């Protein structure tokens, strides 16, 4: 590819090389997230702010019916919190399967009894957190302790 094994190289040199590599997306988003999560673990980039939620899979409770993709509550401040979670490395997901570590709750608690009930099913059990956990962690550039943000 034209980065020289026999010479150690600069920003402009790897930029050129990167712009010459083709465009592709065969890696699954899930494969890719773990490649990134592993590289940031090896080289200690994992506390970097824009990756702080990398190890969080997150469901966002704007659906009036849990897991029904038809029931979106658009124009709520939860939409800004999904921009925020995505911007800082979270795997935001539109369906709550076994793979979820966190559920995020806004103003409308009309769903919390059913999250808590559905969570009785699970082998590894998600947390249910207030919106303010995402906010406070981004503002402090660092994962804030989840226990004060529970339910």
């Amino acid at each position: 590819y034209g980065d020289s094994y026999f010479i150690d190289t600069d920003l402009n040199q790897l930029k050129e090389v990167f712009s010459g590599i083709k465009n592709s997306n065969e890696q699954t988003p899930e494969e890719m997230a773990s490649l990134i999560a592993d590289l940031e673990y090896r080289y200690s980039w994992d506390c970097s702010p824009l990756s702080m939620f990398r190890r969080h899979t997150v469901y966002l409770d704007s659906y009036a019916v849990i897991n029904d993709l038809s029931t979106k509550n658009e124009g709520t401040r939860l939409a800004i919190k999904a921009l925020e979670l995505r911007f800082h490395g979270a795997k935001v997901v539109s369906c709550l399967a076994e793979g979820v570590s966190h559920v995020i709750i806004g103003e409308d608690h009309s769903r919390v009894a059913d999250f808590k009930a559905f969570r009785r099913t699970f082998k590894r059990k998600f947390k249910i957190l207030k919106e303010s956990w995402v906010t406070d962690s981004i503002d402090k550039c660092e994962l804030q302790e989840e226990n004060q943000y529970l339910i």
């Binding site: 590819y1 980065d3 094994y5 790897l14 090389v17 990167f18 590599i21 592709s24 997306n25 890696q27 988003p29 890719m32 490649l35 990134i36 590289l39 824009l50 124009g75 939409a79 800004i80 921009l83 995505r86 911007f87």
Partner: protein
């Protein structure tokens, strides 16, 4: 000077609406002017600090619960009774199978059924109109705030998408360059342990 107006009945005339009107200086607690009408006739009273505070002294009801119960009762179970001659008005807090006295006014009526009804209508029509003006202003103002909020939403979505694509794109290219180096290091490391 402040004021409220409200529709009532009397058990003395069960079939028909009346209007109480309650007007006070600063608070309901300084004392006040009260006015009853059917739609035809002018009843009035003035009942002031020295004796409104005497109500919650003659009665077992304490000041907070009584003035609170009165603003529930008066300023919209309660039950209202008046007689036009005696000008006695009274009302009482009806409970489930017990019932106890709340208040009464020996009112004294006035001469101007019309002037009374005019001020009541003019108050409503003014208070209506000022609120529709405010409702336009806040509506405009907070269209601007939503209009703006929705645009920053849009731009933030563009920035979030550009940031995700920037990561996965850069890491995919890094992974390709890095992995080829790692594979060659492995191949050579093994090839060198062997030769």
């Amino acid at each position: 000077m402040e004021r409220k107006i409200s529709r009532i009945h009397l058990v003395s005339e069960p079939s028909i609406t009346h209007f109480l009107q309650v007007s006070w200086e600063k608070t309901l607690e300084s004392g006040f002017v009260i006015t009853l009408t059917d739609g035809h006739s002018a009843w009035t009273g003035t009942v002031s600090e020295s004796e409104i505070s005497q109500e919650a002294d003659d009665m077992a009801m304490e000041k907070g619960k009584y003035v609170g119960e009165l603003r529930k009762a008066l300023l919209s179970v309660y039950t209202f009774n008046f007689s036009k001659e005696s000008c006695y008005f009274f009302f009482e807090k009806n409970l489930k199978d017990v019932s106890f006295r709340l208040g009464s006014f020996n009112l004294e009526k006035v001469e101007n059924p019309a002037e009374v009804i005019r001020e009541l209508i003019c108050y409503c029509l003014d208070t209506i109109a000022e609120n529709q003006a405010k409702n336009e202003h806040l509506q405009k103002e907070n269209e601007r705030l939503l209009r703006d909020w929705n645009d920053v939403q849009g731009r933030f979505e563009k920035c979030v998408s550009a940031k995700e694509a920037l990561e996965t794109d850069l890491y995919k290219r890094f992974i390709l360059v890095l992995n080829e180096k790692k594979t060659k290091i492995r191949s050579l490391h093994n090839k060198l342990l062997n030769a």
